[PDB]
Symmetry: C3
Subunit: 283 residues, 3 copies
Amino acid sequence: GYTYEDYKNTAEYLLSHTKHRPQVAIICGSGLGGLTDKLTQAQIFDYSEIPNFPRSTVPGHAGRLVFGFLNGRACVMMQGRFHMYEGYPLYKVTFPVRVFHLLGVDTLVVTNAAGGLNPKFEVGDIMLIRDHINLPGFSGQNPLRGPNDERFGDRFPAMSDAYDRTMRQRALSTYKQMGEQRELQEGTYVMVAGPSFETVAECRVLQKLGADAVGMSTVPEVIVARHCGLRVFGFSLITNKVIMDYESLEKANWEEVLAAGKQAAQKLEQFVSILMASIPLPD
Amino acid sequence: TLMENGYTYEDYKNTAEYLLSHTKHRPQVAIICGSGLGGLTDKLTQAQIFDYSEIPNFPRSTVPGHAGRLVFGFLNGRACVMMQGRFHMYEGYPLYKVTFPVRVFHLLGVDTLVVTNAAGGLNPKFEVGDIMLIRDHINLPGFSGQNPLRGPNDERFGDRFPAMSDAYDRTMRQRALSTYKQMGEQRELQEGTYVMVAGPSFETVAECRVLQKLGADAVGMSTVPEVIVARHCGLRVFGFSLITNKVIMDYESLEKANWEEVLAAGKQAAQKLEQFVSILMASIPLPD
Amino acid sequence: TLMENGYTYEDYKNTAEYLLSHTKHRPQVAIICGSGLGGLTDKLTQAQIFDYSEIPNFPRSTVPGHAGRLVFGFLNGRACVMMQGRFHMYEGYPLYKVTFPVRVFHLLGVDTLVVTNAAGGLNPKFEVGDIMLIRDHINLPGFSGQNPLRGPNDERFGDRFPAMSDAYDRTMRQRALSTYKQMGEQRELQEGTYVMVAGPSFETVAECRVLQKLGADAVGMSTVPEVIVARHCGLRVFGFSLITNKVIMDYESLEKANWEEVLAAGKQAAQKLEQFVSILMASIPLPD
Ligand SMILES: Nc1nc2c(CN3C[C@H](CO)[C@@H](O)C3)c[nH]c2c(=O)[nH]1
Ligand SMILES: Nc1nc2c(CN3C[C@H](CO)[C@@H](O)C3)c[nH]c2c(=O)[nH]1
Ligand SMILES: Nc1nc2c(CN3C[C@H](CO)[C@@H](O)C3)c[nH]c2c(=O)[nH]1
């Protein structure tokens, strides 16, 4: 899809257009665009200004790349992201990850909204992503499909350790700092392509498969990130409980999802601030 | 290099107008007849027939048992339009071509879609010749990206993220099941989850068993993408499978699924189907 | 804008005719060599070697442990053509390229295909170094639309809806199991279901757990497309995996799948593999 030079071009475009030198990249999903609010000395890029960048066409995805310091830390944030249901191939969806690597970022934080499949979750919960299930990947939709470029990484990268074990413990301990009543949740994110929401039968297959939450993003970004050796941390905001019986009259919808994010804005902001303090310095 | 719908709003609109200007029929219900079920268009009174090839932007049915004709008429008194034959992803069509007619039906003023198919039996309680109402579906091609709504959303048709949890109209299902206990038939009207797989090869024994483990009662290679585009644009949806064979679930059996036996089960069932479609038409509400 | 086969019947013909004139070999059996199994061409007698690059229409092998050569000759006195290295969908190839050779073999007069691969053990009872006979497969890419038979069907090759429930030849299996339970190692022959996933990245723990729950004993990124195309054109098919690693199934292990060790386990088993493959030639019926 893209040449090595295409990524370099975008990398160089940004490097020459800002003095910031991010160490940490954060991708903000549906309703989590607010996480850019506590950035200091921010510099804003529209995705439309950036060579080779796709556009966010989804409500709650602003379409901006924001550099700054978050709680001391040098960040670049994706205020909005791309999804395969919008029609992008996965090499477009994940394009920014390898540009982050080329900017010298060494850690990727992925966030998303997710439907809750585990009965113990409540709307509003933060689930740490311990693992994932890549259903598009099983059948061919893997962002590494095609010729492998050794300058980014190996032909057959492993995913069994994709989610940093250290940052996960560190995030579990330091969670008492939030003073929140609900304990910090941990579990498996299954990616599904969408854009339509799950039937009850589908929700039940996803539960049987062992997933705790379901969304339509995140996995391709993580795969590309581990391919090029970035440390990865992920979490979902549980925005709704996916309908798991034929008696409920509730149905999933996007407005409720954006609204759950708006209500949890401060909780998330605190969580992410604390998290920056837990990322080790480079070298 | 973005994976989108090839058709424009104009395209659907033109097909709608060509159809509206070349027939006086004004259907409320559209019905899609699957493999061996072309026979459902028999009791159409005042039938008028289009070959798919006449109709601008229409795909062709290449599969045996799919006649490739669009038939307007009345069925048990109700104004219908019927797809005698349908389209499948395994023929090589993108899902946007497979489901193309569903948006045409909407623009014609149809407010109800009934989707029919042949399906392999996964639930061991099902006998060849049973009718299984579709209570729900498992969209495997959709899990991994094969979804007819992939790409730019058109708000003229519907929402970016429609829900599918209520796809199969409950009331019609209640109504059809009630009616059928009075028929005092030898076999029960079955109800269950249809799973879509892409095809065109039939399941291995290990695949049949994953499908049973996922909770599907029937398997086929169609229907789901149509149900999704229909719910997207607000049609009431009803679905049924004619169970045409039992999927091989053990290594002993020397039997194999085959397309001939599938079409032969359609012939054998012509009476049950005809009788069932009656109950069905009298279960569909009147416009307003 | 159909997703059809990009090869014409004549394409296959040209490749076959080219091969048939440039060698005096006439294979009855074709064998596809998986990752680290390139060494199976060693026992071939009177070998004639083609590089894939010479053969018209042939895809190129881009993966380590995949030599990229076609090798005719005799194995335990039986006439063979061996693919020394194969093609995978993760390389970027569509399934009509991945499986291109299978139909050429058919045109060459081949009537039996033996597919080999390396695979990750999902069944706890398996050990690195085991040979697992493929009793069956679970085709995940196929469920969602990645089937090499998608698009127009060419009747000159086969049927529009070939059954796969009898894909792995039952007779060859029994016969191989017998011969082996009288000669070889003390470590007995394994049998099970091979699940294809696309790759090229290795499984999460979560994913490993899914594949286990679906009832797979081994996982790989190949094999299934070639089998489907072979069964489609009426080849007898036999398959086996070399378990080259045990897939990580808990969060406590500090082991990780890696391709270098996969190839290492191929080296380790090279002798065991040859001994078994002779026994195998003796189980293949002769043409009438
Ligand atoms: N598949 C799925 N995804 C989500 C999400 C995640 N994204 C939220 C947004 C639509 O609201 C899409 O990009 C999916 C939240 N809830 C759900 C859900 O119930 N199901
Ligand atoms: N997948 C699948 N589909 C069917 C069907 C439904 N269709 C029947 C037709 C081929 O005979 C295809 O279009 C799929 C009947 N039996 C089976 C089955 O055993 N398996
Ligand atoms: N999916 C998968 N495949 C394999 C294989 C088989 N092939 C080995 C090669 C990478 O080493 C790929 O072509 C897949 C061995 N082990 C595994 C595994 O753990 N997982």
